[PDB]
Design a protein around this ligand. Structure first.
Ligand SMILES: CC[C@H](C)Cc1nnc2cc(-c3ccnc(Nc4ccnn4C)n3)ccn12
Length: 352
């Protein structure tokens, strides 16, 4: 057994001596997740190494995920057990977020399993149960997809990866102030392309719609081959937008773009999903609604007939202290965000 830090696929995981036996789970552009063993609590954990400090955007995404998840406690949202980083800011090159280990994710499960309607129904209920809490906190997740839905054999489901999440205080108009090119391509609402700085939390409902379609068929519904291809896939099934929906698009340049497209008819849902529950296809239609204002909201989605076996507002917590603009003060130099990340994580340090 080496004395130095363990290393997974070339990435040092300086998490010893409490956390050992690291195993690769997955990775992103500036981070890697491994499973590990907590020798102090005698439990299996997942550890998310983030290395963001060279770029302001990565620092913003690290700070947000930490601040939001530390302030969240909900059965359908992954919690933070512990955060590891260096004792001084000059030494801190990485941050390690420790979470309870989940057995798999929905992306992996769908590679090997055709889900029963009951499993689809229960997974969908739980996604929306957690989303209800998220939206009640004035948070947008902005990256819901199968690989961010964690699953246990008991069918417990937890949403993870809040790196793309952010607060939008509804006392302020965020139109024109939101980041473009959010979400993962196949799961992007049309307005992320057509209203790239002025979308709302209804993009999360669009993503959930895409996830439901994927549970129904084990394949992505809108597998765009590149950024501009994505809208074409969406319209290829929804059909060309109605004049009404078109005339709701405030960005003239985007409206003219849509007028310039050849007309596509709508593909009926039961043609794509001929074996699906009719109730499930109705909720899918409401979630994959082109117009973001007519698109169903999370509470109405929970109240939909498809989910009536589970819908229970008395057992569906919401945020007791919804987030406000103080959680949005991060348009700052990456050197200053590094200080804020150091301060948010000090509560896990010896001393403090
Ligand atoms: C580098 C960031 C990455 C791309 C996205 C991301 N961000 N936060 C998380 C948290 C987990 C996680 C947590 C707990 N348990 C498992 N378990 C699991 C999932 C699949 N297999 N296994 C064993 N994962 C996973 C991914 N995550």
């Amino acid at each position: 057994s080496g004395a130095g830090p363990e290393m997974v696929r070339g990435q040092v995981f300086d998490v010893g001596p409490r956390y050992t036996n690291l195993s690769y789970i997955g990775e992103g552009a500036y981070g890697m997740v491994c499973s590990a063993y907590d020798n102090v609590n005698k439990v299996r954990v997942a550890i998310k190494k983030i290395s963001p400090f060279e770029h302001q955007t990565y620092c913003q995404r690290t700070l947000r995920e930490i601040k939001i998840l530390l302030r969240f406690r909900h059965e359908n949202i992954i919690g933070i057990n512990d955060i590891i980083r260096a004792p001084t800011i000059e030494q801190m090159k990485d941050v390690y977020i420790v979470q309870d280990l989940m057995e798999t994710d929905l992306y992996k499960l769908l590679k090997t399993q055709h889900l029963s309607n009951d499993h689809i129904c229960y997974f969908l209920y739980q996604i929306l149960r957690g989303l209800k809490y998220i939206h009640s906190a004035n948070v947008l997740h902005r990256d819901l997809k199968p690989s961010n839905l964690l699953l246990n054999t008991t069918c417990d489901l937890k949403i993870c990866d809040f790196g793309l999440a952010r607060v939008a205080d509804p006392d302020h108009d965020h139109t024109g102030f939101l980041t473009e090119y959010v979400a993962t391509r196949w799961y992007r609402a049309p307005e992320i392309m057509l209203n790239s700085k002025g979308y709302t939390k209804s993009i999360d409902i669009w993503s959930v719609g895409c996830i439901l379609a994927e549970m129904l068929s084990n394949r992505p519904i809108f597998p765009g081959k590149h950024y501009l291809d994505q809208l074409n896939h969406i319209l290829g099934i929804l059909g060309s937008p109605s004049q009404e929906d078109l005339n709701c698009i405030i960005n003239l340049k985007a409206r003219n773009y849509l007028l310039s497209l050849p007309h596509k008819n709508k593909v009926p849902w039961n043609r794509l999903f001929p074996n699906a529950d009719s109730k499930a296809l109705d909720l899918l239609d409401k979630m994959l609604t082109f117009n973001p204002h007519k698109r169903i909201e999370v509470e109405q989605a929970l109240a939909h007939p498809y989910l009536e076996q589970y819908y229970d507002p008395s057992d569906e917590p919401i945020a007791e202290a919804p987030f406000k603009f103080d959680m949005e003060l991060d348009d700052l130099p990456k050197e200053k965000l590094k200080e804020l990340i150091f301060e948010e994580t000090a509560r896990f340090q010896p001393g403090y």
